[PDB]
Amino acid sequence: SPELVKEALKKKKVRSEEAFGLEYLRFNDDYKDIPRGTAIFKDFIIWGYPHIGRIFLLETGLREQFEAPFWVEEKVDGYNTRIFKYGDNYYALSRGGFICPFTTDRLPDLIDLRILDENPDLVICAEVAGPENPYIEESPPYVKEDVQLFVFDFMKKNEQGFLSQEEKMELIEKYNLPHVEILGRFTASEEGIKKIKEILKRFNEEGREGVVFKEDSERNKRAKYITSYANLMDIKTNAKNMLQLPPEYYTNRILRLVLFMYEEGLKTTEHLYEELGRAFIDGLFQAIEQFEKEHKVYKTFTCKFRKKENAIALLELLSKTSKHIQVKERRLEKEGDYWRLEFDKVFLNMTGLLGHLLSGGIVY
Amino acid sequence: ISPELVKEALKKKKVRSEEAFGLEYLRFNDDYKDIPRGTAIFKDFIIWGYPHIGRIFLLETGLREQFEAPFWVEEKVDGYNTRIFKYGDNYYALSRGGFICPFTTDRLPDLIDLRILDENPDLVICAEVAGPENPYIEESPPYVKEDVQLFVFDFMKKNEQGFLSQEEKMELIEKYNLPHVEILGRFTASEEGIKKIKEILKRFNEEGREGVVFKEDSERNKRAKYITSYANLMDIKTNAKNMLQLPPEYYTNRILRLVLFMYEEGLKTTEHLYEELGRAFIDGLFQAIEQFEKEHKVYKTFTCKFRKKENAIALLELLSKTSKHIQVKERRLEKEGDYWRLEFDKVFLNMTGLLGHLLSGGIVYD
Numbered sequence: 001s002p003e004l005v006k007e008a009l010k011k012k013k014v015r016s017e018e019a020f021g022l023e024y025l026r027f028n029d030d031y032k033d034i035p036r037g038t039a040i041f042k043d044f045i046i047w048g049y050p051h052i053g054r055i056f057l058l059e060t061g062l063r064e065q066f067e068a069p070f071w072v073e074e075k076v077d078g079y080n081t082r083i084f085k086y087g088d089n090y091y092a093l094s095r096g097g098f099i100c101p102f103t104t105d106r107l108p109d110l111i112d113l114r115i116l117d118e119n120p121d122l123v124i125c126a127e128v129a130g131p132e133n134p135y136i137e138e139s140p141p142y143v144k145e146d147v148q149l150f151v152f153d154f155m156k157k158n159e160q161g162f163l164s165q166e167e168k169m170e171l172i173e174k175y176n177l178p179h180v181e182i183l184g185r186f187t188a189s190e191e192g193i194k195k196i197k198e199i200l201k202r203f204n205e206e207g208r209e210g211v212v213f214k215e216d217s218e219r220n221k222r223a224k225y226i227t228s229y230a231n232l233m234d235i236k237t238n239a240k241n242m243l244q245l246p247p248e249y250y251t252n253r254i255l256r257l258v259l260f261m262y263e264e265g266l267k268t269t270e271h272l273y274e275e276l277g278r279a280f281i282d283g284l285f286q287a288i289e290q291f292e293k294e295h296k297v298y299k300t301f302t303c304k305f306r307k308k309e310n311a312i313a314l315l316e317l318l319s320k321t322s323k324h325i326q327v328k329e330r331r332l333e334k335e336g337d338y339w340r341l342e343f344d345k346v347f348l349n350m351t352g353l354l355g356h357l358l359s360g361g362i363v364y
Numbered sequence: 365i366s367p368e369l370v371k372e373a374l375k376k377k378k379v380r381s382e383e384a385f386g387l388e389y390l391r392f393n394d395d396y397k398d399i400p401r402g403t404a405i406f407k408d409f410i411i412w413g414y415p416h417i418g419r420i421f422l423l424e425t426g427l428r429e430q431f432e433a434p435f436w437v438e439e440k441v442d443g444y445n446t447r448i449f450k451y452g453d454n455y456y457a458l459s460r461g462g463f464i465c466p467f468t469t470d471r472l473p474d475l476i477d478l479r480i481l482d483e484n485p486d487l488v489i490c491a492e493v494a495g496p497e498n499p500y501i502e503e504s505p506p507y508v509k510e511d512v513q514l515f516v517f518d519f520m521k522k523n524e525q526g527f528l529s530q531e532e533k534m535e536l537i538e539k540y541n542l543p544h545v546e547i548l549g550r551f552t553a554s555e556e557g558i559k560k561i562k563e564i565l566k567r568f569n570e571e572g573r574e575g576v577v578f579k580e581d582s583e584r585n586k587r588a589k590y591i592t593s594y595a596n597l598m599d600i601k602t603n604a605k606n607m608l609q610l611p612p613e614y615y616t617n618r619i620l621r622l623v624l625f626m627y628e629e630g631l632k633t634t635e636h637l638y639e640e641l642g643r644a645f646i647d648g649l650f651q652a653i654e655q656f657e658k659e660h661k662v663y664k665t666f667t668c669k670f671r672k673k674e675n676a677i678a679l680l681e682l683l684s685k686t687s688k689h690i691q692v693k694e695r696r697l698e699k700e701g702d703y704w705r706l707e708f709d710k711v712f713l714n715m716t717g718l719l720g721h722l723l724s725g726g727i728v729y730d
């Protein structure tokens with residue numbers, strides 16, 4: 001409704017947004033069954049992509065959570081996007097509900113959007129992933145440059161759920177769209193569980209993130225399970241980020257590791273002791289080395305745009321959200337057909353804490 | 365300190381009136397406008413709160429940065445802080461928070477001879493109480509094999525904020541024969557000083573001691589503390605059951621202590637800390653899961669002794685009022701020799717509910 005708007009406005013939740021010629025309202029936060037990242041435009045609403053619960057125990061989780069067989073899809077380690085067509089143009093929305101200047105700039109490189117020309121009702125939900133994205137430092141192990149897009153669900157304008165698995169696969173085959181791997185359809189029987197475990201071991205051995213389970217049912221329930229490798233890397237990856245993150249971030253990922261060790265047994269999981277230790281220590285050691293050398297703690301990011309304008313709009317966008325973290329452009333040079341952007345995320349508080357500690361300071 | 369500072373903190377809820385052992389008093393629940401937490405205002409005097417000691421993370425550069433004069437090095441004993449004083453013909457013991465501790469107050473006559481207060485009624489004795497049978501802390505120093513023991517490390521004075529000097533302190537302890545924290549000696553941040561202090565921490569660490577407190581031999585009498593990696597590790601482990609009640613920097617903070625020691629000492633010779641840091645998190649939590657599977661609750665058991673039954677009951681009632689989300693649950697209150705033996709559980713309800721939710725295949729949104 002519009003009174004829903006009123007309440008969400010006055011109490012911050014929703015915000016007006018001005019970008020790409022457009023004016024619209026964006027729920028910066030989840031509120032009374034309207035999900036985060038729902039975006040109210042003039043002609044329509046692109047609903048927020050709902051949260052997928054995590055299970056920590058594979059067997060007991062699959063058994064408790066699901067009422068029917070379920071599809072097992074790869075969880076690709078990138079960032080969520082929802083793509084749609086508005087007028088004769090195409091827009092990519094981040095999870096937070098902003099129009100992504102990188103993704104939108106790059107759509108024609110990443111995906112054939114004929115599907116939207118012929119089906120303008122659809123919202124394509126896709127993971128964008130690769131070593132040269134502006135949001136995350138990790139990449140799937142099979143993407144070694146630039147970024148790739150992987151469709152994983154279809155939604156519709158002004159509609160909250162998802163096209164059945166079979167309609168999703170129908171549109172992916174018909175329009176030859178790039179997509180997340182379908183591992184198959186399983187159940188939580190002893191035979192299903194054993195095969196899913198075999199998948200997760202392979203995923204772990206190859207550095208893949210995990211899987212998303214999708215119920216073959218009207219309700220179409222989802223859940224995700226993440227490998228120990230990915231949970232470890234999240235710890236490591238976030239060393240420089242420690243002051244910005246709730247403690248919960250870490251005790252949640254510790255629990256994930258510990259519950260896997262409980263599920264599979266200590267004998268087969270001893271190695272995680274050292275590796276958990278290295279996930280914390282090695283990233284922090286790397287933060288200290290960097291501070292000795294550069295007097296700054298930061299991550300460097302690199303990525304490519306068709307248009308100079310969009311690289312600048314990305315630096316702007318990262319700047320509005322991020323705080324105590326300086327987004328500092330390093331380079332923007334035309335390299336062939338693209339503009340190559342290099343920028344640093346500077347962690348000002350970690351920078352001040354390490355310099356204070358290293359110089360012999362006191363902390364309470 | 366004055367009347368309208370106290371009036372505003374009663375309104376802002378930094379101070380609260382308590383009553384205990386026949387005494388009615390005002391208690392500083394938090395820091396407020398430089399009045400340290402634990403400050404207790406009695407009608408006849410103020411017992412100032414024990415002030416915060418800062419932590420250095422780099423032993424050599426910290427000592428060199430923080431101190432301008434020589435400094436005494438004392439053992440940091442891992443127990444709980446107590447402030448002990450005379451009122452009328454009675455003696456009382458305050459927790460760091462400023463409550464009159466029914467356990468510590470009950471056991472004063474077994475813990476320490478208080479002739480010193482009789483002869484010097486202005487003194488406040490600052491001591492650590494430590495041992496395996498105390499109600500605040502599961503951990504024990506290794507050299508207290510049972511019950512509890514008390515170790516003086518400072519004197520304060522009624523109505524005053526500072527500390528008796530080292531000399532003055534060492535004289536009172538020698539005169540009245542008080543139990544005291546080990547004194548390592550008087551040092552400077554020179555090359556030689558630093559070599560000796562590092563040998564001391566290496567030894568303590570190998571002996572499982574907590575660390576040391578450094579105390580400037582001067583008027584400003586600046587203090588600083590440094591913790592062994594062993595104690596830092598053990599804190600992470602013994603706090604597993606406690607993880608949902610974690611302040612906004614247990615991670616960044618206890619890990620940085622270990623990481624900066626590794627950096628100071630070299631990462632070649634400190635590699636075993638990887639596995640040890642992993643074990644600290646993983647084995648504490650694994651044990652809380654084993655305990656949950658066995659007893660269907662996640663809890664720590666505490667055991668301690670009183671001269672008076674009313675005091676054990678008063679202790680239970682004190683612990684229920686702090687601890688929310690933590691259930692205090694008596695197991696045993698029984699005569700044992702000339703003492704009432706108390707055993708009780710702190711049940712962590714949130715850890716208990718979370719592990720139950722996850723272990724039966726629950727979903728967590730985040």
Ligand SMILES: Nc1ncnc2c1ncn2[C@@H]1O[C@H](CO)[C@@H](O)[C@H]1O
Binds near residue numbers: 052
């Ligand atoms: N196959 C997949 N199905 C659903 N979500 C996925 C998949 N791969 C990666 N993801 C990401 O995981 C997140 C879980 O909410 C989604 O926002 C999405 O961006």
Ligand SMILES: Nc1ncnc2c1ncn2[C@@H]1O[C@H](CO)[C@@H](O)[C@H]1O
Binds near residue numbers: 438439442444577
């Ligand atoms: N020798 C010592 N000097 C000062 N504080 C000590 C000592 N040993 C243990 N402690 C405890 O360590 C805490 C440091 O904040 C103090 O509140 C005190 O309870």
Ligand SMILES: [Ca+2]
Binds near residue numbers: 077234
């Ligand atoms: Ca990851």
Ligand SMILES: [Ca+2]
Binds near residue numbers: 442503574599
């Ligand atoms: Ca300890």
